[PDB]
Amino acid sequence: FVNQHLCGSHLVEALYLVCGERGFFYTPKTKR
């Protein structure tokens, strides 16, 4: 698949587009 890297707010923005209408977890670890 695609050779892209994302860090900080750029990784949050990609997760917001893929998941922000369902909800998501951006914390380094959680109870999942």
Binding site: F1, V2, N3, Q4, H5, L6, C7, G8, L11, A14, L15, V18, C19, R22, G23, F24, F25, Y26, T27, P28, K29, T30
Partner: peptide
């Protein structure tokens, strides 16, 4: 977790869906 997986290696939309609610 989530913050290292695309910063230290590569990710796609199918890998971002791992961090979705569920």
């Amino acid at each position: 977790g989530i913050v290292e997986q695309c910063c230290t290696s590569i990710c796609s939309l199918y890998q971002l869906e791992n961090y979705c609610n569920g």
